[PDB]
Amino acid sequence: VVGGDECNINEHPFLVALYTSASSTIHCAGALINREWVLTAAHCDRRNIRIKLGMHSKNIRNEDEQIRVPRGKYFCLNTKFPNGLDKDIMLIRLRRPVTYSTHIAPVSLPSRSRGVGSRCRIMGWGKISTTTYPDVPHCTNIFIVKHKWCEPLYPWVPADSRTLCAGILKGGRDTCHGDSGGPLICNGEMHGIVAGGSEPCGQHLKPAVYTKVFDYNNWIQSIIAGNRTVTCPP
C-alpha cells in the first residue's frame, strides 16, 4: 500500500498473508470469513499455498499467529474470459480451523451495496514504494470512483462487471504489488477484494479494481454451507 501508514495492530484481525511452501514472500493477502474459510483473489492461487493468520509484524511475531494450508479451493466457473480474471475471487477452506483471538477474527460481509463516493480502507504487506516491502502491514483510505476510470485501463474489467473502481484520482494512495487478494473495507464491512491496479501504483488518474463482494454473498454463503454445484453471479 502506498501513501499510507502502518495499520493499527487491532484493525485487521481478518487479514491473512499468502505465501508458498517454496517462498516466504507474501505475494497476496486474503480475508478470514469464518473459522475455516478465507476469501482472496483467484490470481493469488499457487501450487502450494501457505496462509499466515494473526500476523502484524513479520519480524515481531504476535503470540496468536497461526499457519494453515488449503484442503479445498473454489472458483467461479462462469467467466467471460478463460483465465477467469473478470471474476477474480477464490474461496480457500483451511485444512484445520482457527480459533478467534484478538488478532484472528472474521470480517463481516457487506449487508448492502455501496457505490461512488463511499470512503473505504485498504491494507496489506505489499510494496510501500517503488522497490520496498514493509515489515508491518500498511493502511490508507481511498474512495470508490466512477467505474469508467478503470475500464480503459484494465482489459479484464469489462463494463457492468462485478467490480468496484477505487482509489485517489489525484494519485499518491493505492494498492500495490503484494496487496492483491486483500479486503477493501467500507464502513466496517468487506465490500471488495483487491484485484489489481497499475504499475507503478499510485499514479495520477489510475485507480485500482476491487471485486465487488456484495454480488458474491450468495455464492460465498452457499459454498461454505456445503453446496458444490452453485454458480457465481452472471
Ligand X SMILES: *[C@@H]1O[C@H](CO)[C@@H](O)[C@H](O)[C@H]1NC(C)=O
> Is 161 one of the catalytic residues?
no
Closest distance to ligand X from the beta carbon of 230 (Å): 4
Residue nearest to ligand X (CB): 227
Q: Does 222 bind ligand X (CB under 6 A)?
A: yes
Nearer to ligand X, 159 or 225 (CB): 225
Q: Which of 72, 71, 70 is nearest to 18 (CA)?
A: 70
Instruction: Rule CB under 6 A: choose which of 99, 131, 132, 229 binds ligand X.
Output: 229
- Of 56, 180, 198, 215, the catalytic one is 180
Q: Alpha-carbon distance 179 to 27, whole Å? A: 7
Closest distance to ligand X from the beta carbon of 218 (Å): 8
Nearer to ligand X, 46 or 93 (CB): 93
Instruction: Rule CB under 6 A: choose which of 8, 25, 130, 227 binds ligand X.
Output: 227
Nearer to ligand X, 75 or 143 (CB): 75
Q: Alpha-carbon distance 115 to 109, whole Å? A: 15
Q: Does 234 bind ligand X (CB under 6 A)?
A: no
Which three-class secondary structure state does DSSP give residue 5? strand
Q: Which of 178, 173, 161 is nearest to 216 (CA)?
A: 161
> Is 88 one of the catalytic residues?
yes
Q: Alpha-carbon distance 41 to 91, whole Å? A: 8
Q: Does 233 bind ligand X (CB under 6 A)?
A: no
**Partners of 144 in beta bridges:** 166
Q: Alpha-carbon distance 65 to 61, whole Å? A: 7
> Is 21 one of the catalytic residues?
no
| Burial of residue 125 (number of CB atoms within 10 Å: 0-12, 13-18, 19+) | buried
Nearer to ligand X, 171 or 233 (CB): 233
Question: With CB under 6 A, what is the number of residues at the site for ligand X?
Answer: 4
Closest distance to ligand X from the beta carbon of 219 (Å): 9
Nearer to ligand X, 188 or 226 (CB): 226
- Of 12, 27, 43, 103, the catalytic one is 43
Strands 70-75 and 90-94: antiparallel
Q: Alpha-carbon distance 165 to 8, whole Å? A: 25
Task: Determine how many CB atoms are found less than 10 A away from the CB of residue 96.
Answer: 10
Residues with a known catalytic role: 43, 88, 180
The footprint of ligand X (CB under 6 A) covers: 222, 227, 229-230
